[PDB]
Amino acid sequence: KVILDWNEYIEAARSVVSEGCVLLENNGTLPLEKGAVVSIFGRIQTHYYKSGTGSGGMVNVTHVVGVPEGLKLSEHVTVNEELENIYKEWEEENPFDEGLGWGTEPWSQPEMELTDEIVSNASAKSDVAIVIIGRTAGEDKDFSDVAGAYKLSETEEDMLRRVRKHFDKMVVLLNVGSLMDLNVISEINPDALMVIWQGGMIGGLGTADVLTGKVNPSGKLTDTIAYEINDYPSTENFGDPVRDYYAEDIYVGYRYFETFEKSKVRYPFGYGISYTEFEHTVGEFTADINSRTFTASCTVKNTGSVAGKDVAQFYVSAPQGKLGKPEKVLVAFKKTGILNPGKEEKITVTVPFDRFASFDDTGVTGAESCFVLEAGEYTVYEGKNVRESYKEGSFTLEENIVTEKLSKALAPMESFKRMKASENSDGTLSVKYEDVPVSDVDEKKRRLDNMPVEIPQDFTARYSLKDVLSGSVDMEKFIARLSDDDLACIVRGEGMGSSLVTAGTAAAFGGVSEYLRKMDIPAVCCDDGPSGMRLDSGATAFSMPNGTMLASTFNPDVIERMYGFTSLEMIYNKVECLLGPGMNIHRNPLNGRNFEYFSEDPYLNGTIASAMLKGLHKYGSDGVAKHFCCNNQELGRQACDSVVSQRALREIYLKGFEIAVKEGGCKAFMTTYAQVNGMWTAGNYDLNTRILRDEWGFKGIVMTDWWAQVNDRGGEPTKNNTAAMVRAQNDLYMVTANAAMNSANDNTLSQLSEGKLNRAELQRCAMNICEYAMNTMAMKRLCRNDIKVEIAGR
Template sequence: MSSKVFDTEKFAKVARRAVAEGVVLLENDGVLPLQAGCNIALFGRSQFNYYKSGTGSGGMVNTKYVIGVREALEVDERFNLNKDLKATYDEWIKENPFDAGVGWASEPWFQKEMPVSAELAAKAAQTSDVAVVLIGRTAGEDQDNSVSQGSYLLTDDEHEMLKNVTEAFEKTIVLLNVGNIIDMNWMEKYNTSAVLYIWQGGQEGGLGALDVISGDVNPSGRLTDTIAKDIEDYPSTPNFGGKETNIQREDIYVGYRYFETFAQDKVLYPFGYGLSYTTFDIEAGNCLYDGNKVTISAKVTNTGDVAGQQVVQVYVSKDQGVLGNPAMELVEFAKTKELAPGESQDFEFVITNYQLSSFDDSGVTSHKNAYVMQAGVYEFYIGENVRSNVEAGIVKLDELKVIEQLSEAMAPVVKYTRIKPVKLADGSFKTLYEDVPTATVDSEKFRKETLPTEMKKREGKSFKLADVLDKKCTMNDFVAQLSDEELCCIVRGEGMSSPKVTPGCGGAYGGVTDSLLEKGIPVACCSDGPSGIRMDSGKRAFAMPNGTCLACAWNLELVEELYNWEGLELRKNKIDCLLGPGMNIHRHPLNGRNFEYFSEDPFVTGKNAVAMLKGMHKYGVTGTIKHFCMNTQETGRHTVEHVASQRAIREIYLKGYEMAVREAGAHAVMTTYGSVNGYYTSSSYDLVTRILREEWGFDGIVMTDWWAKGGKSYHGNNSDMAAIVRAQNDLYMVTSCAEDNTNRDNTAEALADGSLSRAELQRCAANICKWIMEKPVMNRYLERDNDLDVQLASEADDDELDFDKMIDLRIDESGVADINPKEIKTARNTTNMVTVSFKERGDYKLSLTVRAAENLSDLAQIPLSIFKDKELVKMVTLTGADKEWQTIEVPFVGCAMTFFLKLHFAQDGMEINDIHFELVKSREEEFRLMFARMGEE
């Protein structure tokens, strides 16, 4: 293995291509692609503050660089940027700097826009051929979007900019640097020449967007969401954003399933839509049904003048029957290679009976809680979006088929009504409502009937986890020897930024106590997230294109290749598990976390998650599919109960996860903060054991989200570990110390009173140990079969941290010195550097008095990394609940000469009242003798 394995330049090229293929061209009157020599006037604040991702844990990647659209255009010699216009922006930004907000999830949805007067636009038009207008938005964890200016709607300044620019220029291109779809009604007001969603493309985002507008890459991105005329047109709007209850009255009619059935006239841009610089013909071939699957062939031909790629989408229109069904459902898709003009490519699509079935949760088909194919006609369509397609074949089913008989699980306990279509004679659909079947059994009944058997210890025998690996004992033999205390500890993950794993990562689990380590259980490491590896220590990682951007590429091979590189980066940083992909459904455009997720469609969602997992699995690491399930809003995410039918849960909200498990062999799952139909997902036996493990065959680990609640809806708390373990949710994430039970959970108490069995704890321990044994951490620990890790370690970069200013600290004869707290900058991704010099060599102590800012939410995470030169000495993580002043002491042992103290703040919101250095023990004589001996030698 002499050649370099992890090549960031190759990584960047793949990411750049992924961005370019994910860009969606909505409108183009011929202005694009831009011609070489074009003079460009670049408008919009986002040219200086490109959004590489959304906010929160899914976006906090400390990366080496971010190339936005302006930076990309500046280095491209084919185009000329209007320098006078840039100078005007430069002066304005001096008085209007970037507003990062204060603390966790507080960054504004948009940055204040420079007013663009008609005079400024006209002046720019005199020396420019085309205007490019950038509009930027962000949102994220704990911060939904809103129907307000600067979020879903444009601001007055943005309207003024578009009005004046489009009036001054004959050609205006609008680039939307956003994480989710926004209101598009403004397009009717202004004479724009082209409009593109360029999304949030990570560190290569600007280059990927440039590739499309320059014509280096023919746009092939297609929408994975429906863009409606008005936010009120989305059927979920009346039931979105509540803090206590979120009732899914639209049921399975999410996104295009609703619009194509009930409201085609409310759509601006349909699901799957996107333009190209060329044209394609999609020709349907044979459609054959063998009783188990439908096989459809198709040919795609480039009928235009330039090379390009096309997305081929296959839909089914099922007979309504007694259940009712959407007018259209996506069942397959593929993307062509780059086709030259006149070139064709053949495809064959296979659609199984399971894909064509519907879930009967009421028994109206006489098969309650079963996937069935109703008798009737199944019409197949193939084309470039849900609207533009041709008939590909018809399958007639004479009688109902039961595809899979299941049992009641996760049924709602709240009575409500849901949408049901009735097809009229003219082919349109009338909206009716029906009662939703509610729960008839308690999941506790199933749990008690299937309690595991306690594993019995083999007397006189002791084992290491390596013995299981080497087949010297069984996993049951190994787990049976764990004490009650060890069993209580192993289900507790530690973090944030545990010193036991890669600095700055989200969590550590497995051998989190000395006694567990002694039994040969290494400590595994996980880290956020969907936009790249988050390391709060300040260490850099690659910032990925966001989930929506990648899904809009509709190129699964490309996504898998990109995540091959992500897998290597995880291995390079000794991280076993990425906390992603995020794969919740875009139920509503305002969900702040939509940027992490893929689509309103479960099939697109599942396929992209499968590609990402396969990409990481190539190198032995994995991703944690999250948030399981129904995290469709951030508002009230710890308190809201999601109420949905079994059918909606299975056909829409769980389907992608099922695909990830069945098709990619997913190894890790993270449950949500919220509750669904009576239980917090962390404690839902139906969800975690009956559906995930028993129905789908999942045999990996399940972890909670960080500091999640357990128990029943509205009654849960952070200490109900017993409920979490009973559900077979293996890991509670996180505690600061597993052995000290810093979260004061009820595990030991429940074990003592019998409400939690030792066998249930053993079952979770076995899941954890099995998972760890099969991951790279085990071979690193044993130092065997570890060639890739050795190679990657040899390639490690000298990753110096940037710093904003230097502070000089001199400790005189008193052995005491103070740093003025006002000199320390605590903004996010800021590294302060202090030169520390002293008269006396010895052991010193750094004391910091800190607290969280008053305006932070209790769940905010504020990490501080403390370095001595390049060595990470300590990581401190406050939560938003730490509002009282506390003193943190950090030992600096064996200080023999001047060193650099580095304080890195990965997130702002920490207040510092005092920073104090003090000599604890003099080692002057010890060092003098040591140096004397060295001189003699």
Template sequence: MAKNWDIEKFKKTARAAAAEGIVLLKNDNNTLPLKKGTKLSVFGRSQMNYYKSGTGSGGMVNVDYVVGIYEALEASKKFKMNLTVRKAYEAFVKENPFDTGIGWAAEPWFQKEMPFSDEFAKKAAEESEVAVFIIGRTAGEDQDNKNEQGSYLLTDEEKASLKKVCEAFSKTIVLLNVGNIIDMKWVEEIGPDAVLYVWQGGQEGGNAVLDVLSGAVTPSGKLSDTIAKDISKYPSTENFGSDKRNFQSEDIYVGYRYFETFDKDSVFYPFGFGLSYTTFDVGIGEFSYDEIEGISLEVLVTNTGDISGKEVVQVYVEAPQGVLGKSKRVLCGFSKTDLLGAGQMQCTCFDIPKYWLSSYDDSGKTKHKSSYVMEKGTYRVYVGTDVRNAELAGEFTLEKTEVICKCEEALAPVKEFERIKPEEALGLCAKVYEKVPTRTLDPNKKRKERLPKALPYTGDKGFKLKDVEEKNVSMEGFIAQLSDSDLCAMMRGEGMCSPKVTAGIAGAFGGVTEKLSDFGIPIGGCSDGPSGIRMDCGTHAFSLPNGTCLACTFNEEINEELFSWEALDLRKNKIDALLGPGMNIHRNPLNGRNFEYFSEDPLLTGKLVSAQLKGMHKYDVTGVIKHFAGNTQEFKRHNVDNVVSERALREIYLKGFEIAVREGGARAIMSTYGPVNGIWTASSYDLLTTILRGEWEYDGIVMTDWWAMGNDEAGAPGNYQNVSAQVRAQNDLNMVNGNAGDNSNGDDLPVALKQGRLTRAELVRSAINICNFLLKTPAYRHMLGEESALDKELAAAVSAEDSKLQDMVKASFDRDEVELDVSKIKVEKGETTAFIINSKHKCMAELELVLRADNQPDVAQLPVSVFQDKNLIKTVTLTGMDKDFKTVTISMNEIFNSNFYLKFYFAQGGLEIKSVKLKMVKNLDEVFKRGPSEL
């Protein structure tokens, strides 16, 4: 039988994907690729702390190893490394250790750079031929980038150091180990010979950089964003970062759509740009337009250089301006070639449906309001290797405007504002402004007119979920057995770190109560995140390249292959759904979460996310695509209202999700924290029912982000307890609750049912969505006791250490003081004992240890390290002289998850523990009701 799990193949695929995402922006003087034996000096603090990913839920993956850039270069033995320079950085880091920050999302975006003299750089140049300068940035959840040094801008120290290196060396290579694009003015000011975005490449990222620098891989990455000359040139910057309302006046003109239409001169590097070590000729084959099918196009790509490489073919459409106004160019197709040897040619065929050529009329100007239309006029199609380097491939003319798809007004703004649009004259587009159409249809009225119907409550008839699969009963008949309280409980996902699923993961849902479980409903498990599995108990997983890196591959095939391996990692850890990919649009370079999202373009995003979903679906697990929709900044993300036109939503911010649903077969979606046009997305009927389930025919589940609000009317305040609004909108799962049966978060579901604000049929509808999802999961098969050959193989692949972490002692922190069972704690050398604690209250607490040395020499040093979740909170060291029991009190981090971990690690044996007590210091339940951000 063929082997499924092969960690070496996983590594190889991740390494190849990271390499294909590397974008070469500059390569003067044939600096790259480096010849074998080249003498290298590596500069930059980030050689000491490679960023494999960003921070927060999108990056907290525990790994076996991380290959940094310097380590990869050194281990390859291909180059002669300047050890004097390296030792200087090692000494500097000892004096200036890595700053991790304190608490969630607190890590600085950069680390202090090492200053050095001109003489230091000149001496290094005397000993080496080429300099490599690494610049690093992290990014993450709950904090945006800033137009400041050390964030979007280089620091004075970084620029000064880089300038000294460039002046001293004849050849300097700059590597940008960053999650998203940064300011690039320094390229012209300082003039390095070669510049590459190497992104955050996951745990194999350093090896990927080695492959590209050495020429083992010819760079083929293309920019998934436009790099402008200054942050002020992005039209979204003016309205980015508001704490109340974020008016998106740039409308559909995001990224290259804006610059190619209005401001071509403000671009440093255009969308889709990326250099290679070889050259390609892109020729146009047959072009045709069919009134039914759309565009058919052949493109011939020939490698005209001496080195093997891949090229990305990009197809853009220029639609007539008409009465709606259009972007000068819009990506409507792309494809990456195979690896072509010198002189080899490949023919790529594109079939582009009319839907991708149409525009949404939210105003009625075409006399077809709420429809996708192709306005009359001439359509021109361009083919090339980036948005600028694209030549006319063909054109066709429509004599009259055509309706491509009739929709229904949904999610239109209630606040009036102005948006830009082009006014064409002599082939140039000037910016003019028009008022955005506001809402005319009330989504609450729609909801009341379209209430679902459900079978009456029948009580337990003895049917299990398995009977639905075996067609002994309909799903509706099965759900009819559940009481109102059962249905309410099913809407409540549990977590973080629920003991009912794999240790350390983000949430559990489905059969989370004993009664639900008795009906044969399994408990599904989901875990962060886009860069690999996050397990807060310390279990290791594989860290993937970040979203932007994978977007820059422009390669659907390698994304699908990589995520088929990720699927096996999920199966190995008994996780049904990965909380990712993250697929929000890069509206502005300052969004702190851009690193885990893909691109400024929705087609590129949607196609690559679809490929990732297809990879996961091969092994019956899936991704929870997020954040649906409009999460364009992290600052005040729980409350800031994203005010955007219906057209921009449909053409830009929803389009990638639509592709993932229609083409990728998406099964699970996560709504955002905040509101769009006055309605919190978790409670938006128009978003989750009218568009998602109505127009797109989506039949999967929707879950909230962790601790999300809902509201009833546009402009009404959001509330964490307003879960009834979420269920009415068809947001099936409220994430997360400590105990679903007890209603630990105090939601309004029972009261809303009693008052008639929520119907049983709406609860039934969501329960059906959840159960239909669970029927497709490994959790369902495991519940039935069905263990496949794949399950057995993957179980055998779990490491002994990770197996220990999964084998946890359960305890309840349900009183002001609780004593843990010390007989379960293994005190021998090298042992780890982990408790999973279910806390009844959000609180501040302390841990009291009573312990002593157990018959040890006076000079013995006996440390025990105590971890809360993955964070070390204290290392207590006794000596052999501590022969009497000693009481040690440790302050703990705030407990705001219902479940958390306590781990005890003994570096040496010889301690005796008499007691371990958890003591509440302050109850935070009332603070928590105002939202997790208050803690």
């Protein structure tokens, strides 16, 4: 028996919120002074956005603590009740629009028009104005660069200008899933500006902590903020529902801006400020070429007047060589403990060379299909953000080092022009374009040459999955018991809301027939989502902060701590697989689902994902990394084709997922609704077999996205081509209404009959599923050695 202490869960989430808010500007108006009266503007104050919309935004809760309630509960300030009542009375006639069905909730709410009388009267009886701008986000559509979406509405702009005129102290808070336009806000020029993201059901509590100074803000931006949407390198090749060419290649986010267009940046990657000031002093530097590491030290000192944390960020500048390189790539970071005024902390990091290697997808280095360090000078930088990072040390290689030999995989099927760094006389870099080489992989031959060996069936075998778990028999001996019906059944997830598992969840898998359950294969339960359990029964669960807020902490430990509670909460609800982390790269600011992902940077992306997974693993629960890979746009997501180079895949898009496997111990992946390099991801052999298993060494399961399409290359997509799915080693079709009855009328057995699917391929998937299933808490329930959870302190 293990106690889930609900108050400690709350405190853990609250800590994430108070570390994840990002202070952008402040003239001393924050923190709020003890005893201040605050006037809160913005009708969204009454309906705090705790999450985005969609699959990862449907956690049921008894109560949400918004910003006004958080401030009142702090006992540090009071709120102007007259103004609150004006908003309340207006909202009775202008109700919050919840939408009508899936994806229909608008991503902002109409703002209340303000008069000089209301704003003047508020100023007369309060000390400071707080203006809350609210945006939400979600599945199936992207932000438009228009009023009410990425830009302020006319009525919001009016609100901001009136407040600015009447109040000498003005704070702006952005209660947003993803970043919005800051140009007009910056021109209006409030005294302080803070991004507060969407903090889950206790978001107001953690936000009050930072506003009142109980906690000194320490969050940092996980994306670059440029002046215009058209400045982002992906914008030219983003938003087409049919096909988008990833022409920017490795030059995503700060990899582009710092290299080519520094002056287009308003706020750099890793930027964030505090109520105190810090001094970063570069320290000792050594390199160990034989171990393929360097070790770098610095000291961070609090040089201002109040306690706080800061983040030391380390970057590498690789020599341009023949491939071309970004100016700087993030290779390590460390958030200090709370530092009192005048105190300091020494930070030391050891960085493997693989963190700043480049993938040679042309052969120009002499090592085609390898991660490499080209000969030349490597310079290391440390500082407060990528722009304000300064030389830590350097070392020089006289010859190329191959860090890993890989293969030609997931290569583009058509040529396109990509960006390429080009050196100028004055030392600057400019963009030129070059043709990306086209795949020459014989996919048919690759599958045949790597075909697994069939295990001869034996229906008299009475081995239980318990006998495999105990070590008594090999998985191969057990799996011989599965009939062709059992094999076709086990690759089908059942849902949504299968009766085999906790009501109102996403899927049951494994023990999805009477015959499979008789072999002690348990029904394993899957459920959304990254921000908490979605229970369509109406049952309540903990609603946690959004993904971008988590990543903005730059603090894997606080993330891991919070998800350690989620680990127990899952066991309490008998959910084995939480459908997160969502961890697609932030390729463009307008992507609708950015809120539940982490960053434009693959290292930060993988490191935050890994922290979440480590938390979930604490008591033997698990997450599912999604969406593998290159689901960076919502418009046209059932059909759109992402055309991308091997180098960009290897260094940027796959890299976070690689880290989740190798650092996070990830054992479950979800593929996408869309196409990567000319076929759907659920049937892609290179993605799900060559890269994931044979190169990275993943041991686990791969599942489709829910009712995803699958195809054979060049063939038509369908929702029942499970043969193509199994031929790729995508193990689980999510989902069918009735797995045992083959409710989707799938082609597993017909393709097996015709020799187009090999029994060995089905057996490989069945073994992946059973090996996964036997290590879950659902298996432990069958063995009577599960953890029983009791919730205390409600």
